[PDB]
Amino acid sequence: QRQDMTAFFKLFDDDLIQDFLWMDCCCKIADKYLLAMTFVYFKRAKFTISEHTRINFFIALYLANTVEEDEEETKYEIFPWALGKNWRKLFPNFLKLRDQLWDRIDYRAIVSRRCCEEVMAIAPTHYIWQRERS
Amino acid sequence: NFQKVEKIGEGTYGVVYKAEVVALKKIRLDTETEGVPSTAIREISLLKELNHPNIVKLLDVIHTENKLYLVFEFLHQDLKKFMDASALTGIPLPLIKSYLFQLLQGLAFCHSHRVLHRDLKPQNLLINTEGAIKLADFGLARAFGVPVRTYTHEVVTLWYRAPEILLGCKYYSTAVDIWSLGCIFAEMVTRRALFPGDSEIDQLFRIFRTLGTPDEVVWPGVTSMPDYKPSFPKWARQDFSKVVPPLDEDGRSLLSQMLHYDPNKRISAKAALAHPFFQDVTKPVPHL
């Protein structure tokens, strides 16, 4: 458990982040569960308060999609938001950042359903937890 | 590090060398991105949490900036090179029954840990010199614990692909893995692949020919599947004297439940262990 869970949520006060969710209507890359997994990755990677950058959020989200989502193309829409509109030649670098985050969590990228529920239970009425998929 | 002794194989996954003896697997990076493949990530992330005597053991992971080596326990040969070598002499029933038993245990361990293998081909099952067979190559494997995920229909070589996927139905799990072993079960007895199709539509027709063309009394929702068409030729079912002769009738029984059309009434892994086909189960050593 933690009390200091908003170490994660102040990402969802950021302007471009809140718009990024708005782009993702039906939660195809930012599902409620994927947003839970990205937090799991954060504490498995032992992130300090300094390291909660949005670029770290995006490489974490991309990793979650890599593990849990079979459709490989959808997660590519993260590249623009995370790199700019020169992302077409910057995303190899992005993917390499993912490989060290995956390295940093000692390759333990699998997150159980029940473990997602645990982080969703600390403050379950936050608006990112009502990003259900139908 | 240590020294490579010989190159075992080379595919799209990467290159496996033989290098204490370990299996040294170099993973081939992406062309555009220089980054680790999604499959490689899944395989390692899964094998880092799966510890079982009937599952290949991940020993180490060497990450560098342009390279990525995976150290596995070494097993002497796969099941298919073994089945080919026994193609004339035959495979003794006690060893068949031993192998299938072990395979089901490793599989039940995965399914109870909410993991799909999604590639249960003979070539992905490694055997050693003391009668053990283990699951390997978890590149197309995934966890299914998390709700409403996206799944695909690229999963396994047609020969061992369940009909539920061929008919293009979405939302499938574990049942498809059992189907694959069912195919391997038969292929261990008759020594030749059960449904050797060259395309997806052909694969279905080989299955229909052997197991009969599906009804809605055998498969309740078969005719409202995305890739079903009424054009399908209706064949009668052959039974397992004419299909797999050396099998006794507890053997044919387990096999029929492994090849059940309806995924919901298809036999599971933990349950298959408790079949009357495993009372005389021992652990014989094989001939390599």
Nearest CA-CA partner of B160 in B172, B143, B178, B174: B178
Which residues of chain B make contact with A99, given a CB cutoff of 8 A?
35-36, 63
Chain A residues touching residue B71 (CB < 8 angstroms):
none
CATH number listed for the domain at residues B77-288: 1.10.510.10
Interatomic CA distance for residues A131 and A31, integer angstroms: 6
Would residue B209 be called left, alpha or beta, if left means φ above 0 and alpha means ψ between -120 and 50 degrees? alpha
Sign of CA dihedral B232, B233, B237, B243: negative
Q: In Å, how far is B48's CA from the nearest CA of chain A?
A: 7
Please answer yes or no on whether B149 and A69 come within 8 Å at the CB atom. Answer: yes
Domain boundaries, given as residue ranges, for chain A: 1-134
The contacts of residue A100 (CB under 8 Å, 6+ apart) are none
Q: Which amino acid is at B257?
A: Q
A113: nearest CB among B49, B145, B152: B145
Mark yes or no for CB contact B146/A69 under 8 Å: no
What's the reported resolution, in angstroms, to a tenth? Answer: 3.2
Task: Select the residue from A41, A63, A70, A103 to test the B interface by mutation, using most B Cβ atoms within 10 A.
Answer: A70
Residues B203, B166: contact at Cβ < 8 Å?
yes
Q: Look at residues B138, B118, B113, B131 and name the one whose alpha carbon lies nearest to residue B57.
A: B138
Mutation site for B-interface testing, chosen from A33, A67, A75 by largest number of B Cβ within 10 Å? A67
CB pairs A-B closer than 8 Å: 78
Q: Which residues have C-beta within 8 Å of that of residue B243, sequence separation ≥ 6?
A: B186, B190, B210
Q: Contact at 8 Å (CB) between B104 and B181?
A: yes
Domain boundaries for CATH 3.30.200.20 within chain B: 1-76
- Taking an 8 Å cut-off on Cβ atoms, the answer to whether A98 and B35 are in contact is yes
Contacts of B30 in chain A (CB under 8 A): 95
From which experimental method does this structure derive? X-ray
**Cα B26–B63–B126 angle (5° rounding)?**
40
Choose among A72, A70, A60: nearest CA to A34.
A60
Under CATH, which architecture does the B1-76 domain have?
2-Layer Sandwich (3.30)
d(CA B96, CA B181): 12
Token pair for B103: 């395979």
Helices (H), chain A: 6-9, 15-23, 32-44, 54-68, 78-83, 91-104, 113-119
Angstrom distances, CA of residue B65 to CA of A64, A93, A97, B34, B187: 22, 12, 11, 9, 43
Specify whether the CB–CB gap between B76 and B288 falls below 8 A: yes
- Specify whether the CB–CB gap between A105 and A60 falls below 8 A: no
Residue A83 burial (10 A CB sphere; 0-12, 13-18, 19+):
middle
B60 is an annotated ligand-binding site residue: no
Q: Which residues of B are catalytic?
A: 119
A98 CB neighbours in chain B (<8 A) are 35
The residue among B267, B105, B274, B283 whose CA lies nearest residue B178 is B267
